[PDB]
Each structure stands twice: as C-alpha cells, then as structure tokens.
Subunit: 490 residues, 4 copies
C-alpha cells in the first residue's frame, strides 16, 4: 500500500507560449536503448544534443562484439560533447523466453494464420514457423492458451500441442524481428535468475568495459540482488544494481528488493504480459511512490513513445504517459525500440525532453517539498538535514543551483530526494560517481581534480555554470559540503 | 490558471487480485464512435455489455443513409438491452480540411516517396496523388512546411507548390483510408463554424432522429455556441451542446465557451495537430479541472487506445492515458477508430471499462469531496447544499446508492458534481433527461412510467436496483427530493 | 493524551463596534451556584436576563430546607420568564474535608498569626481556632506541611501536631466564611465516594425535587459513576450524572470515567489544591478535547471571575480565562462564589455572557467542523450522519436555526457535537429532556405537547422563533427527524 | 484582521509528573516591575533565580533617586549572577490622569461611600477626598459617569460636578495607595504624548543610566514613535522604543505604530479601562498574531497574577492567562504590582516561570514553523532564508542550540521570528545588543570580545554552553554567521 502524485499549476501562457529552453537543462533523465538505428557516432552526438543521459545495452540482443563497438562509439561521441558524462547500463538476458532468428530478419504475421512454434533454437524461421528459446514449451502450454509475443504486440492462440512443437493461430497482424520476448500463461518458468550467459555478460563485459549499472531482468527477491552483488565481487564494487520489476514475485517482494537495490526499473513490457494490462498503472504509481519516499532512483520503462518506431510524432496517450510518469515522480523515463531499431530515434529523444520540460514546469515545488518532509520520519541524519536545508533555502531565495561537493555522490543523492526546483551540480573527482549520479532526477555532474581546493572547485563550477547558461550574474547558488552557504554569482 | 489530480490509494491487493465486478458498474462513461466495424446489432449488443454509454455519429464520415441504418440498429440493440439507455451524439463536420476519396478506399503511403495533393475533391486518389477539400491549399502552404494527416500519424514535407496542386515528401510509412483530417501549418482557415452542410445534419438528422448531444467541431467562441442554440430552436430545446476544443481559439476563449456550453469535448487529435504535441497534456489537465469546478461534464477524446485498431490489447502508454484521464476528473472517455474502423472494437471497450474500474477504485473519495468543497464558494443554493450533503452522508455511512428524483436532471447533475463513491440513480419520466445524464460521471437512469407517490417511486427503484445487483438487502440508500433521507433496503 | 484549540478570526470592528445582541442568544451556557446573594425571585429573574441556564445547588453548604426554598424560588422566577427552562444541578458533599462554623460568620485571618485547628466539628470558631471535619487530621499531617483552604486562597503551615488538634501559621491574610474546603498534603482521605449523607441528598432531594443532574464530587473511577447510577435507580433514570474531576485519580481514570458519565465538570478549585496550580491548565485543555471528541458536554468551573465577589468588574486574567474556555471548546462556564455569596452576582453573569458572545464571534465554524469530522472515524451511524449533514447544510446556506424534534434528546446531542454556527432548537414533549439538554453548547429547548404532529410542531417552533427574534422571514431553517429538510420562513 | 493560536500536545505524563527543571531554561521572558517589595539586592538575586529577564522602572511612581538606587541595586545583584544579563526598561508617565498623594499613603475606599475628587494635586488625601492630575476633570464628567481607578479595581459613579471638585459614589470596597491610574468616560484627554517630565526622564535617566528600552505610555501614532526616536538622538540610538497600546487610537493605528517600533507592550490595565473588558482578549490575540507575523517582540502585561499581591499562590484564571499568552505567541509576560508592592514577589516570578515552562512543553514546533512559513510570502532575503533553515535543521536533527554570531542582534531576531524548540544562543561584542535581545522569546546572550575570530568565539560559546548545561557532549548545534554550519559537541 501507498498514496500519490505531485500538484500541478497550468496557465494559458504555458499552453500557448513556446518553451525555448535547452533540452539538456531538464530534470528527468533519459535512458536510451542502443542498437542499429543509433550505432553511428554521428547519431550518438545527436542523441546527446536531444537529451540522452544513460545508455542501455540490451544483452538479450546483438553480440558482445557489436555491443563493444556501440560502447566505443559512445566514448567517441563523449569526446565531441565534453560537457556530457553518460552512464552505461548493461541490461541482462535473465530467465527470458524468446522467439528465434528469421530468414529475412522480419516476418509479417497475419491475423487468422497458423504459426508453428518449434524448440529448435538454431532454426531460421518465417511467418509460417518460428522457434522458441524454451525447450519445455510443448509440455508447458495447453490448447486455448494465449502466448504473448513482443510486449504483447502479438497474441497467439494454442491450437494443438505436440512432442517438439506447438501449432498456434495468430490473433492479430504484426511485423516482428528476431529474438522477441514471449510470455507463456500461468507457466512456472524453470530458469535460473543468473545463467552462465548472464555470468559471462557481467564478468566479461560489464566489469571490463566499465558499466555503471546492471539492470537485472526478472528479479524476484532481495536474495537475487545479493547474488549479483556477490557475482560482481571486489572489481564491480562501484557497479549499481537496478533490479527490473517484470513479474508477480517482483511486485510481492518489492519493499525488500528496493531495500537491497541501488534503484529500480519498472519493466512494464514483460510486466504487462504477466499481469492484466489495466493492473500495470497501479504497479507503476505504487513503485514510484515507494522509491520517492526511500530516496531511491526509479526508471519508468517500455512503450512510452511506441508509435515513434514508425512515426516522427507520438500519439496523444504517449505524450500523457511521459508527462504523468514525470508528475508521478519518476527520476528517469526510457526509450527502447524507439531508439534501438526505430525510424526516428532523435525525434523520439527530442519530444521526450520537451514533454519532461513541460511537466516539470508545472510541478508545485513548494508543495512537493512539504509532502516529502511530512512523509519522512524525523530525527534524520545531519547530512540529510543539511541536504534538505539546501532545497528549502534554494526555493525560498529562487537560487539557480545547488552545488554539492561529493566523492561518493551521497550528498547529491540526499539533495535529489527532496526534488529541488533548480539543478543540482554534483562535483566529484571519481569517474564512477559522476556517471552513477545520472540515474537521479535533476543531478548534473562535473568531474573535478582529485585533490583540489573547495573554493576553487566551486568557482570553476560557477564558471562552467555561466558557460552552460545554467546561472547568470546576480543569481544565488547554494554550496554544500557539515555546512551550507549562499554565494552570489559575479 | 488551475491546480489538480485526485489522490490514489494503491494496495498489493488491487494489483494482484482479479476485479470480477460488472463492466456497466463503472462511474466513468464511454463514448463509442460507430462505423463499419460495429454496424451490426450483434456487435452493438456486445459493446453495450462491454460498457458503452453514449453513441457517437461522425458526420465527417459515412452518409445520412449509413447513419440512419446505424441509428436504427442501436434502437434495435436497446430493445435487447432494456436496462441500458444510450445517449446519441451527432459530431459535426465543422470548418474541416480533409483528404479526398481513394480508388481502392485505402492507400499504403511509404516513407521517402512523393505525394501530389490536388484541389479537385472528385479525384479518386492512390499512393501518389490525393485530393484536398481546401481549394486554397497551394496558396496556403510553402516549401518546407509539414502537412499533418490523420491526427498527425502521417507527416508530409512540402517540396514544391504549384497553382492547382502541391508536391510533398511522405516523411513516414502509413496506411490511410478516405477523408482523413488535415492540419495546414500556421494557416488561418477561411471557413464558417456552422456551414449549410452542418445545418442540414442538425436540422434533418439530429432533431428528427432524437440526438441528445451536438458535439460541435472547432468551436472558437461563446457566440458560436449561442449560434447553435438559436439554430436548434424550440424543436431541439432538450438537445445538449458539447463544444469540441481543438484549436488555439477554443483554448483562449475556454472559460466563456464553458459558460455557454452543456459540457466539453477535449478533441486531442486536431488540437495535437494545431499546438505542439507536448502541450496537449497541459490543455487536458486544465480543462478537466475547470469543468470539474463548474460541474460541467467533460469527454477526453482521441488516441486513448489507438494501437487497438490492429491489436486485441493496448500499449502501456494507452492504459495510463485512460487511467490518468479518470484520476484527472474526466466524466467520459472516448473511442474513435478503435470502435468505428478497428479490428477489435469489443475488446477495446472492455479494457477501457476495466481501466476505469481500476482507476476509480484508487480515488480517496473523502479527500476528493473535501477538495471540491474547498474550491467552491459558500453560500451556494439550498439545492446544491442538499446534493452536497447526500454525497457526504453517502460516504459517512457507506451507502450503496444516491436516488435522485428529477424531471430535468438538475438534481442528478448537482450530486454528480460532488463525485460520490457510490452510483447516482437518476429517476425521471423524461426520455431526453434519461439519455442526457449519460454524460455525467456515475449517473445511471431509470425511466419512470408515472409521477405517483414519492415512496412508491423510491421502492420500485430499489427493487430494480436489487435485480440489477447495484444494491443488496441491508444496505443504506440516500433519497434526495428540498430534502434528503436515508433508507434501509428490505 | 490529545491536541487542540479552535480557529479565531479577529477584525478591528469586533474590538471597536459594540455587541448590542440579547445575552440569552449565546451558545455557551452558564451554570450559576445559588446562595444567599441570589435567593430572591427578583434577583433570579435578573440572573435569567443576564444569561443563567443551569442552577447549582451545593449540598456542602446550606441545608435541605434552604435548598428547597431556593429551588421553589427558581420555579417562581421561571413563571415570569416562560421562554427560559433551567436545568437543576445537585452538587454532592462527597469525601470532603471542611472548615467549621464560626461565632461571627466570618474570620479575618492575618499573615503570621497562629491558627489552632480542632476536630470538634460542633465548635463555633474564630481567628485563633477553627474546627476541621476530618477527625484523623492531627495524625494525617506533620510539621512543615501546607494545609490549603478555600481553593488555596488561604495557606497554613503546620507548626505542631497533638492528639486532638494542630497548631498552624497563617501564611497570608484572607477573610473566610464557614465550611470552606480544605486540602491536606499527601493524605489519601479515608472517606467514601458516596456517604449516607450523599445518599440522602440524592434520594431525598434530587429525586423528589426533580433535579436534572448530579455533579458528583471527587469521582475516582467508572465504578463510582455506576454506584451513583444504581443508587438513582428506576426513579432517577432521567437524572444525568456529571462526575467532577478534582483529584489525581479522576485524571488518571478520565477516559473510563468519561465513558460512563453524561458529561464532565472540571472542578478546578480542589484539583488546583491537589495538583500544582501550573498543571491545571493542561488538565483543562485535555479534558475539553476528549469531551469534544466524544460529544460529551463539559463544564469549566471555579475562580473564572473570582475578583467579582468584591468588584463590579473582573481582572484582565479573568476575561481571558472565560474567553479561552469557550475557544477551548467548553459547553458551559460556571460561577460559584460570584453568584452564591458575592456582592455583584448580576454583573458577574452579565459580563460572562458578554465574553462568551465575543469569543463565539471569533470562531471559524467551517474550520471547526472540518477538524471534528477529521478526528471522528468513519463509518458513523445513519443518525450521527444526518446530524453531521444538518450542521454542514446550515453553514453552507447560512441557516438561522437547526430544528431537531427529539424525545430523549439524542438527536440534539448529535448535532451539538458538530458545533453549528447557528442555534439548535430542540422540540420535546419530555420535561426532563427540555431541561437536561441545557448542558449542551448551543441548544435551546421548547416543550411541545405529546399528541402534536411533526408539521404542527415545526410550524409552532418557527412561530416561536420569529417571536423570540431567533429567525426572521426569508431565512432558511434545517429540520431533522432519518431525514433532513430545508424550510423557508414565510 | 488576523487568524491564530499555537497547537498544544498534552499527555497525562505532563500533568502528573513533576517538572523540577531550572526556571531560567524557559523561552518566554519575564518583565518585572521593580518597587519597594523588591528593593534589596538579596530579593533581586532571588528574582533572577526565579526567572526575571527585564527590569521595569515605572516613572509614574517613586523618585528619580529611588529609581537610581534601585538601578544600582540591580547592577549589584547582576554581580552575584554573572551568567544573567538583564534588560533595563523605562516606563514613561505619558498623557496620564492619576489619583493624588495621601496623608496615610494608603486608604480603604468602602462601597456606597461618598468620595470627593479635587483638582489641586498638592493635596494629601484620605478616604473622603482624593486629588486628580487633570484640572479639566469637572469640565469633563457628568452625573452618572463611571470614573475608573487602578485598572478599574475601583468604580466611581458621579453624583454631582462643581468647579474645583466632583462628588462620586465608591461603587465597591478597595484599599488603594498613591498615584493610581484614572480613566474618564468618553473624554478626549488634552495632554501631550511626551511631556517635559517625560523628556527629562528619557534624557537624564534612560540615556545616562543606560536603559535598553522605553515603554512609552499611551502611543497613538507612528508620529509619536518618530518623535521619541528624534529625542533619543544618536546618543540613545541603541535604545528600543516599545510603544504601549492602551487606547482606541493605538488599536486603530497599530499597524503603522508596529511598523515604526522595536516591539509592542499590550498595556491591558489602561486598555481594559478605555474599551469594554470583554473586548481586551480580542485586542491581545490580534496584536500577538500581527507581531509574530512581523517577527517584532510583544510583551503581555497587567493583572496576570494580580491575586498574588496578597496570596503565595494564584487563582485558576491567572494560571490560564499566563499559559494562554505563551500559547498565543507572546515573547514576554509582565509583573506589575505582584513584584513592585506585593507580599509575595519571588513566588509570583517562580509560578510565572513554572507556567511558561509548562505551556512551552505542549507547543508543536514542527507545526508552528510550518504555519509561520505559510503565513510569510516568498521570495525572502538570503539572511531570512538561512535563519529559517537554521530553525528547520535544528528541529530535524534535535539540535541543542542555534549559535548566532551577531553585532546588532539582526541574525538572532531573524531566527527568533521562526520560534525554534531549542535555545538561540546570541553572541555579540556589543553590550546594548546583549541586553536588548532579552525581549525576544527563547534568546540567551553571551557577551564576547570584539577582536576575536568567529571560530574562537564559537568554541568559547560551546565551552560556556557546556558549563551552563545548555549543550553537552554528543549534541549537534547550529552555528549561523551567509552560512549555516552543524557542529558536534566533543
Ligand atoms: N461513420 C463512419 N463510417 C466510416 N468510417 C468511419 C466512420 N466514423 C469513423 N470512421 C473511420 O474511423 C476513423 C476515426 O474516426 P473519427 O470519428 O475519430 O474521425 P476523424 O477522421 O479522426 O475526425 P475527427 O477529428 O472529427 O474525429 C476515421 O478516419 C474513419 O476512417
Ligand atoms: N447554598 C449556599 N449557602 C451559603 N453559602 C453558599 C452556598 N453555596 C455556596 N456558598 C458560598 O459560596 C462559596 C463558593 O461556593 P462553592 O459552591 O464553590 O463551594 P465550595 O466551598 O468552593 O465547594 P466546592 O469545592 O464544592 O465548590 C462557598 O464556600 C460559600 O461561602
Ligand atoms: O525489460 C524491459 O524493459 C521490459 O520488459 O519492459
Ligand atoms: O475531432 C476529434 O475528436 C479530434 O480532433 O480529436
Ligand atoms: O467543586 C468545585 O467546583 C471545585 O472544587 O472547583
Ligand atoms: O501601563 C500599563 O502597563 C497598563 O495600563 O496595563
Ligand atoms: K507609566
Ligand atoms: Mg497603563
């Protein structure tokens, strides 16, 4: 249980006058799933200009080599955009059930047609016959059952179950590519949380490549989170674990999963295949509420701008979904197929930033802070109080920035919890910190020198803030490191 | 200048437990647009069972012939569903700009290909050449301009402009049928709000057929409402006027439009094409808030479950759009192409009812009553105070129903304003009242045969309520008629 | 414990413009202790005119015959004021320690002088030697102890202890009469809750004379209240038990005492002698809150306008004490020595009415209603719901009266709990009801005939209301009997 | 116009358990009027221990030499108590009307006795004839007029008026001394705001002796305040002007008077004689509410514990008066005759401190700060923001103190406005600041060295706070000087 959503203030002015502010000045961060549509350095720079903050590498697709290439192109895109430090997110395979490979890379499934599902996962399929990664499929499904494919974009009714295959009837026309996700109704999937393939993805890519986050697919318990932490060991001590909530067990054990985790991802695609589509908005709102209360970052994911895979504009529902995720209190929003395989990756990232800018602009921050402080039980730590004091002071004097000097990012995470109206400028001499803080709403990072003076580091930040149009002369800034001070910009 | 959104109480119970209640028990009413996909009595009966409350007739499509056949098949579906009293809504053409007629009724437009937009509206087009209703189109657009087609699901870049035609580039692949809506960028449309074609539809369909509402397209002022009211005359005195807000002028003059109107339609499709898409959510939240304060009913429309024109289940953004429209304070939600030309009309309506039930079970109704009461100024009339108290009493004792005895529907309209947790049972002898109240959230009507004893009317209504499983023996009911009484079911 | 005090609104015009209103129009009711100072029918009539609602007969003073003569003078006063129905309250002796009788009816005790305390209670004393009613006095005190007399107005330090007597030092100058109350420090009084004399006062005066309330001195448990209820028996079934909280045991067991009681008296005199004076204001604010939350009436008693026993004007502290008792939420305020023995009984009652009216005019009834409704947990009974709804409907339409037709008084008590801005006119055929309801803030009673109908009764009530200037033509009145109706005075 | 009162939290524990805490640890400060009852150094030392914070010298009484010997005795007492820095308050005569001098210095006026009131102020009166300071007296009052004496403790009905005297009837029995204040009914007193006697008192006592405050009698306008400021000149620039509101003119112009002043004194004695006594509680609450809003200090004065001039313990009304002034939001409470001429001055100050501590113990500081912040419009100055944050932080971490380094007292006043739960420890090099901040609730000063750094002054303060047990090992303290730092006591 929980109670929700931030108070809005909408004027005619907001609806009619254009919001010409920079797309990178927004508070909500964007997770972009990388793939063929945005592989080039040139597209990665365009995505940075449009508002990309975190890069998602889905290990359910591609290969280590193709992911290694995309990763290095991101590093080259960062050399072209020095004021942008991107977080690197590895999204695991986990205990997934997938469709197979295809002869012509795309099949055009038609409503009313029969589709045979085979267990030979090496088989290159076509619209008449496709493979399933799950060898127990014939024994697991029964005639009448609805197999869901690609976030439920395809529904198949089981007609007959055999020894090695299943005959289905396609219930709707859809075009799908390779290795689409699947859901088998009321089937207890006999698959480990961490497979040998997951182990090779984490140890042989995540740790050597320098990923900041592990988005663990299908987490069911706090024990699963500890298992990954242990797998990561001493070398991966700075890699954050973001469990993905996408099954009933993740919902039931949410509170404990959240306690062990470094943040959460609401994996609505697979979740909306497991539970009734109408139940997902409840699960979304509940999980955001809880995360906001614990000060843990949350990523709202999947089918946010779905139509944008084919159209340069989103539907009406898609706009409200992004806006309402922001007003619910999400730290991040996410783009999946819209960036990885769609026709308009840049225009998808662009309008998402515009929707975030609009939604953030009508939030009632004075009220938002009051509602947080009322929910959080006091006494609180000295660090939390000073962090909170910074947010209230910033709001009272209409300060442009909160500058936090932090090695671990702890101070910045504490300020972020109180959702200030202004940007948080986290200043750190750690490379993991400056990229890990990207998952927290409204936190912008500057990488500083390891043993540099408090006041010189603050002036260099003010100088970069002036250089980035974040603050002008005459403005006030809050500086925090246990103390808080108000500096007038000059 | 508004402030909004109701408080949600979400438990694990709500997420995980199946809701097995009747689809017609929901408070949010559904407007279905009728068309070829639901032309049969069998299908029209399935939509009634699924939760349809108001039938929409888009006079921009079909013919007077096709619409008469449709109207009469609804009357036939009602004979089979006597506990359901549907409202009939005529949606005007208005000062619209449309794509013309097609050779094979449907075309597959492809990304990067050229499209010739001609001004001869008799030209049966193909994927290379399509007619445009606004003869002034070549002199109205300029090279580089983005023409929007079918709620902006098709974007066209003007390459060159000629005397009688325009040459564009199809910026995305899309399949479109006949008479798709068009938006011309920054063009002041020289067309009347009420045309001769519109007058013929109102005077020779709406009045003879007995339409309960006029959804007036592209309303820009209160004088346009006054105009339709005077047009309707005495013969159409019980017909409600529902201005559609779908342009900048409709937004600017919203307050004056609202004051003259009988309710509002948020026509997001054409509005989303007129203003930047990211600004539609702002418009929607502001208008719902303003209507909620005035006690005027509001219909949230377009692209609510768009993906369901092809798939038997919606996207994650579609589910939240509906849920959020309900939590915003909308009275009705609408289906356009999802029921008119879609492949899954019955499943579209069904999931829409399920999302409404799920969102309504969230609302903290005691907090919602308090916020309405705080935002309204005391003193109010004796009539409003008694309606207000019926809602408060109903909530305090957890009453099953609020039974309103009303000729006009005014009492039911007042109770509905205070949004109670239980159903408002509106008892009227008037056929127009009974069918008009369908636009107010949570109002269910019984048509009474006479105006006998005040206690016989109430007793017979409880007997009907019990049979319909709305009320059970031992429940309390509130009866309002100026007084309020609490009655025990026996 | 609890949390408290109602919202005040002070304008300059309230401070400067005179309050010309009738003194009996106030909501807060006055309890006047009757004695030699107000024995005459002539004075009792002026006391009615100055705002007296309940008469207190202190059985610690006088005699049965003297109390009977006064009671019959109250009945003659009421014949001259037929619009005034006084409640009769018997205050029991209880387990009290009293000073004796005096040779000259008064003693002028001088600071520094020695005072001998004797145990022969038949001895008429003087300035040098006064009797004490507690035989165990010399064995109950030790040298250095401070004996408090007359609400702590006299302090005596024990110098020496002997078999049959005690020698003390008068610590302050004071003039005192006979049978003043006493407090012995750290003494658990070896006296019963109800003595044979208390039994005789109850059964031989309260039941035969027809008293409406028993204010029981020194109640320590719910067992004491049940003892009294059983002592009253069938003949005393309509007599209300108002326990007096005047010792630690009464505070410790307050919640259980309150549950059995029909109301509470904050007997601040003795309580102020038993506990530290600074602690009494805490006890008072807590008790009023607990009573207000239960809908049980409370009387704030003792030393409210003390200085007015000698002066025609009160002190600044005395005015704030009365005003603050009203804002705290007391139902009644009491005058003890101010009316029973003082030099200005009429001017004491006059100013008390005037402070009450001034403070009642500060109250924000909308905020007061909201607070109570928030504090009381739902579901509430249908009866309590319609009572609550009559309060809200009256405030919403600015109604002049709440007309409640009740036999037992139950309905009027339910309305009185939600503290309306307007008077509650209770109509009852029961003579006990009509006199008992006086202890409730804002309730005015009219005795109706047993065989009169609802319409006849509501019409005569409205007629009396016009005659009494309680309501005028054009005003709205709420009538409740389970239903609520709004009536226009014509 | 205003709305008010601080929310209480009372438990049985606070009522039954003894609070044996140091009387100088309270937040509310005490203003003591010095007179013959407390002339000795030994008594002044006991008054300091009992909780005296400001010394009032009423120049309406005694001689210039009497006040000087008194001031010197205060200076001597302060040498025995060095951890206590008292404020010196001069109370002017103003445009006052007084009773004359007596040949027995104290007379006993009896009820129903005739009294002559002469205009020759050189006459030594008895109970049959007393002098008046207003020569215009028999040309200002008519038969039936009630002349008031000594805060209205004596009422005098005019029997007849002549040329040099009047004949009145003593309406009550009272013993009075020399120079008692007087109020003439509906008479416009033709006297100056500051007389030549007031001029000599301000210029030849307040400036040379070093008074910190001037409580100016009967201030009517902002022009009167500006006049005193002009008189005080640059020599007395550090002297605070505390206007006394004791007339209709002072209430009508309170806002402009408050704007010009350094604080306010609610002079209830004369005020209660000018307006109806039942209206004084309205004035008190409105004025406190307003002063609290502007963060200006307010003193609640007269008859707070009046009965204590004769008794070692107070009335019930007196306890609620002090307690309720604290809960209303008063900075100081004052003692007049209780300390200047009474029989029990030490016990009066003791009980006053005990009531303060009790009232302060039930204040909800988190709710108080919330209400203050909501009542003050944003943006505010950086100085007010930081000060506000010191309060919020202190409450969040349960800090022991707020240490404010301030030269003028500006910082400490800004903190005092937000009423923290912990003591404000103001540190200043200035002697006037240290003795002026006493008028602000919860402020304690330590006088520091002028040429010492911030960090040496803070660690010295901590060691003094430790010695006084105002802070201890393990505590958090907030240090403010524009910044806020949280210091751990080690
Ligand atoms: N009566 C009808 N007959 C045939 N097709 C219809 C009918 N009504 C709607 N449609 C089809 O469904 C689609 C969506 O319906 P809808 O009523 O929303 O029309 P529209 O083109 O979007 O215009 P508008 O902006 O007025 O709603 C139409 O474009 C059309 O293809
Ligand atoms: N009926 C009476 N006859 C004579 N004197 C009375 C009477 N009632 C009260 N008094 C006088 O008024 C004073 C105050 O009255 P009060 O009723 O408060 O009694 P009390 O002595 O204070 O005892 P308690 O604690 O019951 O109030 C008494 O002490 C007595 O002097
Ligand atoms: O993995 C995801 O993001 C999902 O399933 O939605
Ligand atoms: O007309 C409509 O309904 C629209 O444009 O959304
Ligand atoms: O009996 C009383 O009223 C008292 O003691 O205060
Ligand atoms: O002067 C005063 O203090 C008064 O009148 O109260
Ligand atoms: K004076
Ligand atoms: Mg005075």
């Amino acid at each position: 249980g929980a109670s929700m959503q931030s108070a809005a203030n909408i004027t005619l002015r907001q609806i009619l006058e254009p919001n010409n502010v920079n797309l990178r000045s927004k508070k909500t961060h964007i997770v972009c799933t990388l793939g063929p549509a945005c592989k080039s350095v040139e597209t990665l720079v365009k995505l940075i200009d449009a508002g990309m903050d975190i890069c998602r590498f889905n290990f359910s697709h591609g290969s280590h080599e193709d992911h290694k290439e995309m990763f290095n192109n991101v590093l080259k895109a960062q050399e072209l955009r020095p004021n942008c430090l991107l977080g690197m997110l590895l999204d695991t395979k986990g205990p997934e059930i997938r469709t197979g490979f295809l002869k012509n890379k795309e099949v055009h499934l038609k409503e009313g047609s029969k589709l045979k599902l085979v267990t030979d996962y090496e088989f290159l399929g076509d619209e008449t016959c496709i493979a399933c990664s799950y060898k127990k499929l014939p024994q697991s499904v029964k005639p009448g059952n609805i197999i869901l494919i690609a976030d439920g974009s395809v529904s198949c009714k089981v007609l007959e179950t055999h020894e090695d295959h299943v005959i289905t009837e396609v219930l709707n026309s859809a075009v799908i590519g390779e290795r689409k996700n699947m859901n088998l109704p009321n089937v207890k999937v006999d698959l480990p949380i961490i497979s040998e393939k997951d182990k090779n993805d984490i140890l042989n890519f995540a740790i050597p490549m320098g990923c900041n986050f592990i988005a663990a697919s299908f987490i069911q318990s706090a024990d699963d989170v500890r298992l990954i932490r242990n797998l990561l060991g001493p070398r991966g001590r700075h890699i954050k674990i973001i469990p993905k909530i996408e099954n009933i067990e993740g919902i039931i054990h949410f509170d404990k999963i959240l306690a062990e985790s470094d943040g959460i991802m609401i994996a609505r695609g697979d979740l909306g295949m497991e539970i009734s589509p109408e139940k997902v908005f409840l699960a979304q709102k509940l999980m955001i509420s809880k995360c906001n209360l614990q000060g843990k970052p949350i990523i709202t994911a999947t089918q946010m701008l779905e139509s944008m895979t084919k159209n340069p504009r989103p539907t009406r529902a898609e706009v409200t979904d992004v806006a309402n995720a922001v007003l619910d209190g999400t730290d991040c929003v996410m783009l999946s197929g819209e960036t990885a395989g769609g026709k308009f990756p840049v225009e998808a990232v662009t309008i998402m930033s515009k929707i975030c800018l609009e939604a953030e602009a009508c939030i009632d921050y004075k009220l938002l802070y009051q509602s947080l402080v009322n929910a959080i039980e006091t006494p609180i730590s000295v660090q939390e109080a000073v962090a909170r004091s910074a947010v209230e002071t910033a709001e009272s004097i209409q300060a442009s920035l909160i500058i936090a000097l932090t090695e671990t990012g702890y101070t910045a995470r504490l300020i972020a919890k109180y959702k200030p109206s202004c940007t948080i400028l986290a200043l750190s001499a750690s490379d993991s910190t400056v990229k890990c803080l990207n998952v927290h709403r409204g936190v912008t990072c500057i990488k500083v020198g390891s043993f540099q003076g408090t006041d010189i580091v603050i002036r260099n930040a003010i100088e970069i803030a002036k250089q980035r149009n974040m603050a002008k002369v005459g403005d006030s800034v809050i500086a925090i490191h246990n103390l808080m001070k108000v500096v007038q910009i000059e």
